[PDB]
Amino acid sequence: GWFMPFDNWLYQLQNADPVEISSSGFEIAVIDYSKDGSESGEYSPEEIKIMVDAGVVPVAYVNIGQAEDYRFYWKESWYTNTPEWLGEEDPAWPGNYFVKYWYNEWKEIVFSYLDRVIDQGFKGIYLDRIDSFEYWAQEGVISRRSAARKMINFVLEIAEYVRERKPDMLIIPQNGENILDFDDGQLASTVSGWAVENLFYLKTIPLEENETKSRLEYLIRLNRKGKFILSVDYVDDGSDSFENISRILDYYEKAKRNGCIPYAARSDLELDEMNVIEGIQPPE
């Protein structure tokens, strides 16, 4: 039934090696735009073309809902003279900061990041912290509809920007899929696909059946429209215990039965390795 145009995928945000990935057998790889996150680690065009040459589609992670204090755009002056749009540090991810993504200064930061990513030769972008719209709504800073509309429009503007230069660029948001409650249909046509974390499992622990089914409502609808879905659940505890590999198999089977292409990732959340599991990932 399902639209499933990739056989597998890779999510690796630290220590990604183009050579390793080239000959792994993963068809699409979502990595960072730099080897350590910093400006000086930026992959060269050559390093990215290794993957392209091998038939892998490389895609760049870009966080559009938080500022990250190690990136090329961060300024020392923000500590002493803090912009309005720069907010509190994320308790769960030190060095990340919620931003008022609707302010021009932020949007233009992100556009300047997409500029580097286009020049490097990446073939999609993977957009994290769509869910910042929920954060600001919940802080009571702006209304939820206002937040949702602003984030939708920002993703639309992101799409316009990169497709002016690279018309077939893939666009994959991560989470915040319920933002589609406020879409008129344009966002759902504009993306190539959507990615989610924690659909069947929160690390090693399975989720209530209704929570899962709620998310799937959005994803199923997007699948029927020709958009692929990448799942990543953080299910591999690192052992080759029975309990562990049973869980991996269970996650793989639930993913594929609902049109989600799975990647079982380490329970540590570090996404620091290529993460192969003998005759499961990649698949036979």
Author numbering: 29 to 312
What does the paper say about this structure?
Endo-galactosaminidases are an underexplored family of enzymes involved in the degradation of galactosaminogalactan (GAG) and other galactosamine-containing cationic exopolysaccharides produced by fungi and bacteria.
We could not detect any binding, or enzymatic cleavage of the GAG oligomers, for the T. maritima enzyme, which raises the question as to whether the T. maritima enzyme is an endo-galactosaminidase or whether GAG is not a substrate for this family. The TmGH191 crystals all showed a varying degree of twinning. The structure is composed of tightly packed trimers stacked on each other along their common pseudo-threefold axis. The stacks of trimers pack into a sparse honeycomb-like structure with wide wells around the pseudo-63 axis and a solvent content of 82.5%. While no distinct density for a bound carbohydrate was observed, difference density in the substrate-binding crevice of TmGH191 suggests that something has bound, although it could not be conclusively modelled. Some flexibility in the side chain of Trp121 was noted when comparing the native and soaked structures.
